[PDB]
Design a protein around this ligand. Structure first.
Ligand SMILES: CC(=O)N[C@@H]1[C@@H](O)[C@H](O[C@@H]2O[C@H](CO)[C@@H](O[C@@H]3O[C@H](CO)[C@@H](O)[C@H](O)[C@H]3NC(C)=O)[C@H](O)[C@H]2NC(C)=O)[C@@H](CO)O[C@H]1O
Lengths: 47, 46, 46
């Protein structure tokens, strides 16, 4: 549900959606490490 | 067939040369982490 | 309070510590250019 933008970190995404980082991680169990994601990939955000 | 220069990122090389970001990443599976590239590295242009 | 590993960038260190790039930049005003950190350099992680 969010397309990663250049420079984004998980904290920035968490700030934008006002949700904890661990909730975003739990929505994406296929991700090996968020340090491998690149801009233009889309991650799921639980509402 | 592009040599990384200081200051480059994979997104900047894709935007500057008009290559899609998923295409440049898929052309370069030898880059373990697309966020970490170094000057002098050669990357493939699809 | 953290030693830069070969292969670290400020963005990778921020993502490891669950913080943002501005926060790690703010903590390190001795770093002239946040894109350029060196192996073995000591930085602050707040
Ligand atoms: C896929 C994508 O574009 N990701 C973005 C990241 O690339 C970008 O981080 C910056 O990445 C470059 C390239 O890896 C880093 O430069 C490297 O930095 C190290 C440590 O200083 C240095 O040894 C390398 O020589 C140098 N390489 C080059 C080619 O100059 C740069 O430091 C990263 N910047 C930061 C602040 O961590 C991040 C952040 O802009 O965004 C991703 O979206």
């Amino acid at each position: 549900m969010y397309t990663v933008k250049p420079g984004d970190t998980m904290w920035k995404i968490a700030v934008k959606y006002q949700i904890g980082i661990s909730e975003i991680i739990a929505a994406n169990p296929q991700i090996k490490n968020p340090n491998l994601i690149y801009p233009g990939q889309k991650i799921n955000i639980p509402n």
